[PDB]
Amino acid sequence: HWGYGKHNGPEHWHKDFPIAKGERQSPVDIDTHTAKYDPSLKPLSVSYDQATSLRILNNGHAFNVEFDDSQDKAVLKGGPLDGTYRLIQFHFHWGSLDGQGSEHTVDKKKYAAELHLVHWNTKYGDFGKAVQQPDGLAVLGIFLKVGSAKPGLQKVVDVLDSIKTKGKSADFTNFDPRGLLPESLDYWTYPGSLTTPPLLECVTWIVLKEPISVSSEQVLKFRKLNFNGEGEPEELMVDNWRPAQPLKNRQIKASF
Numbered sequence: 001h002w003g004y005g006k007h008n009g010p011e012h013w014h015k016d017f018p019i020a021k022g023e024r025q026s027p028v029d030i031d032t033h034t035a036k037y038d039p040s041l042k043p044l045s046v047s048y049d050q051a052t053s054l055r056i057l058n059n060g061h062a063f064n065v066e067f068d069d070s071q072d073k074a075v076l077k078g079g080p081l082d083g084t085y086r087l088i089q090f091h092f093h094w095g096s097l098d099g100q101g102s103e104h105t106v107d108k109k110k111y112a113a114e115l116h117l118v119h120w121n122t123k124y125g126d127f128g129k130a131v132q133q134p135d136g137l138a139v140l141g142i143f144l145k146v147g148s149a150k151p152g153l154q155k156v157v158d159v160l161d162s163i164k165t166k167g168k169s170a171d172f173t174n175f176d177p178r179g180l181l182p183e184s185l186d187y188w189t190y191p192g193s194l195t196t197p198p199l200l201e202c203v204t205w206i207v208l209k210e211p212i213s214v215s216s217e218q219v220l221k222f223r224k225l226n227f228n229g230e231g232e233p234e235e236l237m238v239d240n241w242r243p244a245q246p247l248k249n250r251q252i253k254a255s256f
């Protein structure tokens, strides 16, 4: 199936997922000098105080920290969003080297990794129905740069050896996603899509300007994960990022 290898990578996805060449695909390069401040944007509200993480899973593409979304425990509101969006899971995209890893770029600059907190519009009832709507999802993207260690990420880092291969999962309760946010909520927003197949165009992207810093040791542990399942030839889980796609007929707005 799809992956990030030479024969099943981003350049091959379109054959099974035609929308890969669509009109609102993600990620995109964020040209800071073309994005315009938008006064109509309301203050962004990230309410993760009642978040309930459940477990962490290696799905063979990345690892997802899943949350209980049967109620409005962890939600995203405001900004360019209408209504309430429920956090369902978060994951990262990273590279084999510190100079690459992020999916979105800023003035062509690539970060070592990118965090994606996925939320679905509660007016659609469930994630499944949400991915059938143009405003069904909202993903908060956060860039990671190598520097000082990020305390709030260590818990994730230390559980990774228990989910080394595809299909493995482990309990991951009481994790606070607020520990992964930067001080400032300044952001850029634009209409986009999932950056992984099925590449559905149902996402309102909210990408924070301020990156969080993680240590070399922390990202190094991300790179020890496997794309393969237990017992198969080892393929390190690195460079699981989709490159920038054509912006086409879209405008990126800045909250600042």
Ligand SMILES: O=S(=O)(NO)c1ccccc1
Pocket (backbone or CB within 6 Å): 001, 002, 003, 007, 008, 009, 012, 013, 014, 015, 016, 017
């Ligand atoms: O998911 S894909 O990249 N679509 O072309 C793929 C490539 C090779 C074999 C199976 C799937």
Ligand SMILES: O=S(=O)(NO)c1ccccc1
Pocket (backbone or CB within 6 Å): 057, 064, 065, 066, 067, 088, 089
């Ligand atoms: O797609 S997932 O991240 N892993 O299965 C998920 C998380 C919460 C609920 C359903 C699915």
Ligand SMILES: O=S(=O)(NO)c1ccccc1
Pocket (backbone or CB within 6 Å): 116, 117, 118, 137, 139, 193, 194, 195, 196
């Ligand atoms: O676009 S993503 O944030 N990363 O590909 C995403 C992944 C799974 C489900 C929704 C969004």
Ligand SMILES: O=S(=O)(NO)c1ccccc1
Pocket (backbone or CB within 6 Å): 003, 004, 005, 009, 010, 239, 240, 241, 242, 243
């Ligand atoms: O574009 S990718 O397929 N995923 O990031 C890639 C694979 C190997 C090296 C760089 C990029």
Ligand SMILES: [Zn+2]
Pocket (backbone or CB within 6 Å): 091, 092, 093, 116, 195
């Ligand atoms: Zn992602």
